[PDB]
RNA sequence: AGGGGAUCGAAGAUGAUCAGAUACCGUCGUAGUCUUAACCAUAAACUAUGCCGACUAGGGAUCGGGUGGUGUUUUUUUAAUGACCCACUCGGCACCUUACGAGAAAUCAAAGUCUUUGGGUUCUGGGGGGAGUAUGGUCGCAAGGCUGAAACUUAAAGGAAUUG
RNA sequence: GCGGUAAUUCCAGCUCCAAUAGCGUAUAUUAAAGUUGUUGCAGUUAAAAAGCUCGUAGUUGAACUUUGGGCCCGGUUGGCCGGUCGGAUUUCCAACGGGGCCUUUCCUUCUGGCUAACCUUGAGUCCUUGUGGCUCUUGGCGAACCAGGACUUUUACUUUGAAAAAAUUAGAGUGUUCAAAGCAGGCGUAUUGCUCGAAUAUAUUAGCAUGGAAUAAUAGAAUAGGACG
RNA sequence: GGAUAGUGGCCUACCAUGGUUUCAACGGGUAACGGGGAAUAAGGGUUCGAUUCCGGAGAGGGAGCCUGAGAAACGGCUACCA
């Protein structure tokens, strides 16, 4: 306050701000790869579903949508990238 | 404030606030001058030697006199950390 | 910006809008409605010269108490009847009924002057002389 | 909605100085904003400023010293003819010895004395003292 | 405007003093006269190719173009062989040091060597009085359509 | 913000600074340009496609991994609809409000809500028709609109 | 114009009270009060405070959305949930303290960034009374609504605060 | 606001004030008036935000497209000397402008008329040890504009200039004895004429002519009916 | 085509349905001739110009016309009204 660095703000208090109020705006949502050991391969899912995503071959389930990040179904794993 | 040929006219060049570079003028009686004396080997605060700062009554009223003093002193080297340029 | 349009092309709105609000000015309105020429006992003229009908003592307004001694006058270019005050102690003995007086305004812009209610004018000359001269001594009222 | 991007810049800069700060983040910059900030800085009324690149219209971090009483934008850009620059400076400048009206000529964004030297005229952007 | 017949009127439409001798057999039928108006306006090919008469044409007609050359945008094509254009401009009002949008409408004769559509910018040039109103004649079409064939149907 | 109410809300996508990439996404331009068409061939809207390819598939934004927005890609393959998608969904809306209004003449709130929708249709259309996507003299009329949408 | 017409209740009639008492109080009770079809278009329809945008300052609650947690409470066998707790973030209805600042003040996070006077735009006012009167137009079944003067008069009328 | 019995406002006397060959009154208008508010008003409670939203005309409207670098040319003040018999220009110098280059860079375009300019150089040299300096024709600049052909997205702004009545106004010169004025007048050999004048400025909105390319519009290529040749 | 000194709905004949307008048409008021200019001095403005120069209009009101290079003349004529 009264003097500070607006060009190099702390990574802690940039982390709490709204995605549009950061210094250069960008998304907070991520993509993930999901598996359900019935199936060998892995679909890539957006963290925020809308559509309830079904896997490659079998109609199973993956996530139901929410007002937000999708709840993943039951036994599943995920990596992030 | 010079004149036609060279001569300094217009009495009394005022002080300036150390934080804001804004004039401190006669009737500001909320202003301040903080005298910080220099030290020497093994204690010993050395009378008659100072590093001085002048803070306008504006800044003091706005509650910034403290945090603004840290930046000022630490940049002159009489504080080590306490102040962070980033937030 | 509170109101007035600041754009570079808003001149038309700016003069239209000012043209409108000039009508709240009392003088601009009076001068364009021609109230001078339309209403008012004088034509808009500086003075006007009528004929004395009766002589009135006017009862002065509060908190004064007096009798103001005016004359009912019928303007010669008009026929408009007008009551007009006769200043300066005496000077009611200077007029007479059917005498020919020249009246001026009171210097209030219409608007009756003093404790005198309704009187917007004053006598200046009688029988072509000027009450002033008669009131002091400098002149005498003509024969008839 | 934003009617002058220059406007919100100059205003925010003035609310920095008035509130006693040393820096301000302005949005969303512009070509006109930059050449305005340059004319100030080249007479010293602000310090160094940094265009940051969002993939949008931009942002600027201006460092200001406190020599600056006011910067402001004349919001309709009036046309000035070479002899009416006298009347503009006279109206909004604190005194004849300093401070500038900065305007837009076909010779580019430049302050009024540079305009007087180069003898070009144009519309009027703003002023700085 | 015109459009066909060429010969439809109670009087025979011809060019003055342009004679074609019926004795001398000619493969063009009628001999046709024209000129260049000047000032750089290309006398368009539809005037030299054309069969229309129009003694008010600046190329094939008896009018000279001199005085003002103006441009306006075509606001009306209704009356025969003449149009009305609107010319906008801003008027400076000094007290407010600002402008207001104004316009005038200039009636102008247009030879049927130009096909004028409403919306076209058109270069027009001055004239001896052609009619009660028309003081100008259409000398160039600077517009075209403004995306006429871009008005067509779906995919 | 919010032309037709006083709601000031800020909600929107924050688009990444990276204008290429992910680099963890592999596939190809070829890969998803078919993936677009196959869904438009099913009848999906370009928004429904971008949403669908965002979740089941790895398409961050179709516009990065292919040089074109989803609607140009549909247009080029001859998939574009008669009216744009946003205009359609406005008209589709007004149609149902109206049908509701004829069934209830006592609902003054619907009348007001109908006016709004229609006024958005009329301004949007005026723009689309200015920019040549809709022919001039294209007009929305409630008499003919229920056929337009269905 | 139909219906409905329990309640309360302009009008009217009464019992009181009063010098009087056309009232206040008590009684009776028409219209009305409710509904359908259609008018009317007005309220101190008030935040007596146009709308869009930007900037300027702290604080604890709270409504809605979301995010984070080896949080609490729920037992079953851990969970899953749900309700709760704590931190942050949008977007609300408000309060609190500040006053850099504004104001004639009362007060005001706008009523601030205004003689250092220009972001965009709509509207209304120009002393009081005459008077929202006259007149014309217009809308209405009507009651009335919108538009809306002048002659003349007048030195105040008025706002906030102070002491009596 | 004074006058109802000691009237600082009336009627007089004395004395005094302001302006003075003039001074008062009436009417109008202008300044005072930021009470008409473009500059520049005000609208919670003093006059004043339409009960509310929609909405046409009107006004207004985010950001982005040659930026940066290198060299050349010659101007006008000002500094330190002055060479000189108050003003002079070269070298030293900063400063501020103008022109033109080359950096991927239409300059409308060919078809020659033209060349003023060097990549030239043909000789060498006035002269400070030589790129300080220009005369000078035999291979080698286009734009400086002639004129013919063929074509050209529209504007706003701003610069300079032309076309321009006089009197008025601003203003220079001139001692109408001063002055308002006037455009006169001033010099000898006043016996035989000599001589400076009779400026300059404003003159805008529109039209015309020229330079600028920031600001702000406008048009362009998507069913390719694109651009080049 | 007629008429004009001559262009032109100037007029006539035939033909068409056009022309202006909220960027205020049309209509009304003007105690309105227009201009060069005048008054008021921070600037911006406000107000005024019958009137010594320029232009236009008129000769009690209207119309008509002879003469003439030139007048729809009035210190010319003819008629009607006053
Ligand atoms: Mg009023
Ligand atoms: Mg009487
Ligand atoms: Mg008479
Ligand atoms: Mg026709
Ligand atoms: Mg918003
Ligand atoms: Mg809106
Ligand atoms: Mg509200
Ligand atoms: Mg009763
Ligand atoms: Mg009783
Ligand atoms: Mg009682
Ligand atoms: Mg009301
Ligand atoms: Mg939990
Ligand atoms: Mg009194
Ligand atoms: Mg006595
Ligand atoms: Mg006395
Ligand atoms: Mg201005
Ligand atoms: Mg006021
Ligand atoms: Mg009020
Ligand atoms: Mg813009
Ligand atoms: Mg040429
Ligand atoms: Mg004809
Ligand atoms: Mg007259
Ligand atoms: Mg006049
Ligand atoms: Mg005159
Ligand atoms: Mg006038
Ligand atoms: Mg007269
Ligand atoms: Mg007479
Ligand atoms: Mg008559
Ligand atoms: Mg005559
Ligand atoms: Mg005579
Ligand atoms: Mg005569
Ligand atoms: Zn599966």
Short mmCIF file of N, CA, C and O (backbone and C1' of nucleotides) in Angstrom, two decimals, chain H residues 81-85 88-90:
data_model
loop_
_atom_site.label_atom_id
_atom_site.label_comp_id
_atom_site.label_asym_id
_atom_site.label_seq_id
_atom_site.Cartn_x
_atom_site.Cartn_y
_atom_site.Cartn_z
P C H 81 35.01 36.05 -25.74
"O5'" C H 81 34.94 36.67 -27.21
"C5'" C H 81 36.11 37.09 -27.89
"C4'" C H 81 36.68 35.98 -28.73
"C3'" C H 81 37.38 36.39 -30.01
"O3'" C H 81 38.69 36.91 -29.86
"C1'" C H 81 35.90 34.64 -30.49
P G H 82 39.16 38.16 -30.77
"O5'" G H 82 38.86 37.70 -32.27
"C5'" G H 82 37.59 37.92 -32.87
"C4'" G H 82 37.70 38.53 -34.24
"C3'" G H 82 38.12 39.99 -34.24
"O3'" G H 82 38.98 40.25 -35.35
"C1'" G H 82 35.90 39.78 -35.12
P G H 83 40.56 40.36 -35.08
"O5'" G H 83 41.25 39.45 -36.20
"C5'" G H 83 40.48 38.80 -37.20
"C4'" G H 83 40.52 39.54 -38.51
"C3'" G H 83 40.15 41.02 -38.41
"O3'" G H 83 40.76 41.74 -39.49
"C1'" G H 83 38.58 39.95 -39.75
P U H 84 41.39 43.20 -39.25
"O5'" U H 84 40.61 44.14 -40.28
"C5'" U H 84 39.74 43.61 -41.26
"C4'" U H 84 38.40 44.32 -41.25
"C3'" U H 84 38.45 45.84 -41.23
"O3'" U H 84 38.66 46.40 -42.52
"C1'" U H 84 36.88 45.07 -39.63
P C H 85 40.11 46.99 -42.91
"O5'" C H 85 39.81 48.50 -43.35
"C5'" C H 85 39.83 49.56 -42.41
"C4'" C H 85 38.50 50.27 -42.34
"C3'" C H 85 38.49 51.63 -41.66
"O3'" C H 85 38.94 52.68 -42.50
"C1'" C H 85 36.67 50.34 -40.87
P A H 88 25.53 41.09 -39.51
"O5'" A H 88 26.87 40.83 -40.32
"C5'" A H 88 26.93 41.04 -41.73
"C4'" A H 88 28.32 40.83 -42.26
"C3'" A H 88 28.97 39.50 -41.91
"O3'" A H 88 28.60 38.46 -42.80
"C1'" A H 88 30.50 41.28 -41.52
P U H 89 27.22 37.64 -42.60
"O5'" U H 89 27.61 36.15 -43.02
"C5'" U H 89 28.30 35.89 -44.23
"C4'" U H 89 29.71 35.43 -43.98
"C3'" U H 89 29.87 34.04 -43.39
"O3'" U H 89 29.79 33.02 -44.39
"C1'" U H 89 31.23 35.56 -42.20
P U H 90 29.92 31.46 -44.01
"O5'" U H 90 31.44 31.12 -44.35
"C5'" U H 90 31.94 29.80 -44.22
"C4'" U H 90 33.31 29.80 -43.59
"C3'" U H 90 33.50 28.84 -42.42
"O3'" U H 90 33.72 27.50 -42.81
"C1'" U H 90 34.31 30.96 -41.81
#
